[PDB]
Design a protein around this ligand. Sequence first.
Ligand SMILES: Nc1ncnc2c1ncn2[C@@H]1O[C@H](COP(=O)(O)OP(=O)(O)OP(O)(O)=S)[C@@H](O)[C@H]1O
Ligand SMILES: Nc1ncnc2c1ncn2[C@@H]1O[C@H](COP(=O)(O)OP(=O)(O)OP(O)(O)=S)[C@@H](O)[C@H]1O
Ligand SMILES: Nc1ncnc2c1ncn2[C@@H]1O[C@H](COP(=O)(O)OP(=O)(O)OP(O)(O)=S)[C@@H](O)[C@H]1O
Ligand SMILES: Nc1ncnc2c1ncn2[C@@H]1O[C@H](COP(=O)(O)OP(=O)(O)OP(O)(O)=S)[C@@H](O)[C@H]1O
Lengths: 286, 630, 224
Amino acid sequence: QNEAVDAVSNAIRRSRAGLADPNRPIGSFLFLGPTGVGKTELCKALANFMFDSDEAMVRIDMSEFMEKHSVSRLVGAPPGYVGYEEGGYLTEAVRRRPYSVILLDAVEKAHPDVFNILLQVLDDGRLTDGQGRTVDFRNTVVIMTSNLGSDLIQERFGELDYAHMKELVLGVVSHNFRPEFINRIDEVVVFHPLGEQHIASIAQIQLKRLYKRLEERGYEIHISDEALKLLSENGYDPVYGARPLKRAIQQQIENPLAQQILSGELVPGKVIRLEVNEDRIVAVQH
Amino acid sequence: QALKKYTIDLTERAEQGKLDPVIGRDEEIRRTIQVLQRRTKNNPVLIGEPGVGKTAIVEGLAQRIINGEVPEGLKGRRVLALDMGALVAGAKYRGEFEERLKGVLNDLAKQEGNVILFIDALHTMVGAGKADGAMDAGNMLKPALARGELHCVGATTLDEYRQYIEKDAALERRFQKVFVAEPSVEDTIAILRGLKERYELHHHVQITDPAIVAAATLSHRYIADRQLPDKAIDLIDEAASSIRMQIDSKPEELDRLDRRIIQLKLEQQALMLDMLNEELSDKERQYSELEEEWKAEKLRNKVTDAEIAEVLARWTGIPVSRMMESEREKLLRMEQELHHRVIGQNEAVDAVSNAIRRSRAGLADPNRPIGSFLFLGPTGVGKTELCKALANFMFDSDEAMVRIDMSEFMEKHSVSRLVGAPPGYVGYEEGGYLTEAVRRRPYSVILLDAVEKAHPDVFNILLQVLDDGRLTDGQGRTVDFRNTVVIMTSNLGSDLIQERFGELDYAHMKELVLGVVSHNFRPEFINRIDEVVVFHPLGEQHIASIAQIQLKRLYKRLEERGYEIHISDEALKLLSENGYDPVYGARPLKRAIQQQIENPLAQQILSGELVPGKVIRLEVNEDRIVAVQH
Amino acid sequence: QALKKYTIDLTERAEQGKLDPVIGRDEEIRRTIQVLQRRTKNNPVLIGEPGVGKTAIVEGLAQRIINGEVPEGLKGRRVLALDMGALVAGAKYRGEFEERLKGVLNDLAKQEGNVILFIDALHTMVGAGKADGAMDAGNMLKPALARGELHCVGATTLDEYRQYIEKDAALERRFQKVFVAEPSVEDTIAILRGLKERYELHHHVQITDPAIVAAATLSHRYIA
Ligand SMILES: Nc1ncnc2c1ncn2[C@@H]1O[C@H](COP(=O)(O)OP(=O)(O)OP(O)(O)=S)[C@@H](O)[C@H]1O
Ligand SMILES: Nc1ncnc2c1ncn2[C@@H]1O[C@H](COP(=O)(O)OP(=O)(O)OP(O)(O)=S)[C@@H](O)[C@H]1O
Ligand SMILES: Nc1ncnc2c1ncn2[C@@H]1O[C@H](COP(=O)(O)OP(=O)(O)OP(O)(O)=S)[C@@H](O)[C@H]1O
Ligand SMILES: Nc1ncnc2c1ncn2[C@@H]1O[C@H](COP(=O)(O)OP(=O)(O)OP(O)(O)=S)[C@@H](O)[C@H]1O
């Protein structure tokens, strides 16, 4: 996903050199593209970069707003109503820390009332909450994740350059969203499904954090290259992204390995080598 | 003077060494010292969520002024803590509180600017001592605060700041906001090294440094309620309390056994059939063996990471502890324990067993729940029964689980009955069903039965839940689901599994019914699922074993009434005959047992015919089942 | 003094033999004692839906203190029950609630850490003396709680925990939550055996042990 990391990178580098437009938020993005290709992971890697934590961000899961009356969950309770003295969820959580990252997770699930609220947000950097005061959004990176071009990108990403694909999935978004809300967008970026090499590198990252979990537990693992090849070939299909990799690693390693840890079988200290049998993956002790 | 009566001196307490050491917080102490040395508005307020160390920043400022590690403009300051209740307390008459507060202001003027003041819980001050003749203590310190003549340091919570001080814009702007961010895990470990010294000195135990890094790491992971370092310091302190209690009289295992033997002793005394004298003799022998082992090892004296883990597994309920031998031998025999109530259906018992074994061995993904499951298969084969066997295995009770029947959610409104209502609307003040139920009990089997009956996009709530274990209710507070077991049971391939279960392996069956679910659910949602199992229709030997299960629980139902029943295997073969069809599963067996046994048997009980104590033999008739008295 | 008036001595009542016997609740009293013997935040709170026996846990702790089954660190402690009704009771003049309550804080902290304070209905303490802009019991006790000088065993219902105490998050972090489990059928049978003895002494009757096991079974099954 080189294009999206370029887009977000250039947004923060526009802000730090002063050239940001101070009537808007810093970058209003819309992450399209199919499931399991790292939309929420680019948001998490941003907040990990900029703020030194994975969940140090205003994560709003937009699929809890599927009705017309859940706008008040983020703006606030209007005058003379129940939860009045606590404001909203978005406006307070920004009005505390005005340089934050706001993840509007799974944006298309909600009702278009929230999209009107975010019209005001993405264009002018203010969103007057329920108690009757502005909230300064001129310094937050608003990020939105969706998958409206799932079939289109999964089927036709080959033999097409990036601009024509962007125009085609942007047409699909224009069928889904109003022209207002996609006019306010700083940059729609388009993802792409993962090939063998991408899932191989993601397999190495997930195995590094598996090693880190067992190193916390007190164990070590070296792995065979053939074992990692079986993990990368058992967990490759273009429809579900990089998640069959995660649950394939989860099954084939973590179930028999934890089976043998609980069995009183695998002694601490020794390097637990993960090499293959004919088709299974066995954990050995030598 | 008034400052003797109404202020309690911190630098005298820091000078006599009555304050715990303050570690880190370079940025916030430096900004408090920058703000305290201004010309107008000398007033910092310390703002951050409760537990992050704001009073500790003022106590670190007092210790740095006593040690003299401050600039030269502060060498020799006195930091005096103002107690607004001690001002309010004896002010019965009119104008007594204002006389007290004005005496404090005159004495602070006579100190020639040498006294830093300190009002912890600054939100106490707004509207303190108001009456009809109100000067309110926010309206009398407002001139002395505006002109910078008073060096007050407040320390109020962020929500208490929004509620109480931003309701008064003049006194809102008299104060400079020093934000006190939650310390991360590493800063907490440093803070816990200094407070390790102090807590070791109090509890007379020795906190090992792996227990410190365990306390900061574990309480950052498994507690979303409170904030660092306070939750980590609480794990350290309560762990040292447990170690010192074990040191005092005897360990907790002999405590369990002593309480149980005195309990069953006076309980058998109260019974003066039993199945109690056997239990009491076994527990007395177990007490003798563990007391012999305690005399053979003459124990715990230090706080290790295992004590931190047991304290956190008794704060919450999440099984963080090391597995004892009874529990580990129970848990390696997982599938034998589950096939006592779910006979047949090996694939799902393997899947569920492996998810719980990954949980307990500590390999589970900490950003997701323990395991999501989608039990597909035809009606009456064991889907809801495996979830009840899960709660009866794991939680020792059948109905001890969060059961959300997805056949009440046939409309899109009824997402709101598991997130709660938004602000303004009716059921705001009570929160969601699911979210409150998890926020009480964070380790629980969450079942979503009959899941294909719901509205198609009610499963967007579950996009959040299954992917990241966090669901955000109506009021705002996100509930952490990351230690739960989510299970949704459906029957989307009923006729397919009934038809093509023969001549097909498990893999192609899973693929074909997964195509069926691909026409039902969204590609987002069937990607979140850890493991879709596929159930299989029940055969004749399965139904024979199910008949034995139902007849054992019928004997259990008729022993309470006071009757014994023995059955002959010919009648059991008849119930294997009259209770078999592939299309309806295992309930034709249950209603065949119901009819052909319980209707003539209860007929004959209420007939005044069947004398208790005599064994009711269920031999066969020509075709029926007789019940005789011999 | 002040502790004569605004507190009720449980250990006097347990030592006079006026409380009910308490059966079971072993992990709950053990974690209550593990929380009461801390350095800072000595404050547990018994949470669980009403009926499960939370005041019974604190009275069981009082009977274990008097009859000598607690550790050596608690042999000799008094368990005083604070009266939130008596503290507001006469104070209509300004300050007099706070005068009473800080007199209680003086006379407790002057006991050298001997009196375990008990507040059934902790959610009453939340907004107790909250006058027209004055000091309630929450904001007064709040700094003597997170130094361990006040040993406040709360006992609040779980629904009113969410309604009243989580509204004020600072007083919420001072108290360490001790969950109180709803007991099984079998523990209920044991509880009913001790209280069988006491109710037979009350009503001048006898109670057969089938009526106990039927009472636990039937009340668990049919009253929901
Ligand atoms: N390009 C990637 N690099 C690293 N990890 C990735 C990548 N793509 C997916 N992952 C992994 O897959 C998960 C992230 O998938 P998500 O981006 O959260 O799915 P998604 O992008 O939200 O698509 P939907 O809308 O949920 S179907 C994490 O567990 C990551 O470890
Ligand atoms: N930076 C720190 N260095 C040393 N100890 C700390 C630090 N931060 C917190 N603590 C300890 O953590 C505990 C809680 O901190 P507190 O300052 O008392 O919380 P708080 O700042 O009072 O917030 P509230 O709203 O007043 S409860 C105390 O025991 C402190 O000694
Ligand atoms: N493997 C089994 N072992 C024992 N009893 C079983 C088994 N499978 C089903 N039963 C009986 O089946 C009854 C209900 O079966 P369920 O599994 O609850 O039906 P289901 O699987 O939920 O399918 P639907 O679509 O919800 S009707 C229980 O009373 C059990 O006695
Ligand atoms: N372990 C026990 N030993 C003896 N009696 C008990 C026990 N548990 C509960 N009880 C009895 O159960 C009843 C209720 O106990 P309480 O402690 O009053 O419950 P409770 O938790 O105070 O209910 P609320 O929510 O405070 S009104 C009393 O009659 C007690 O005697």
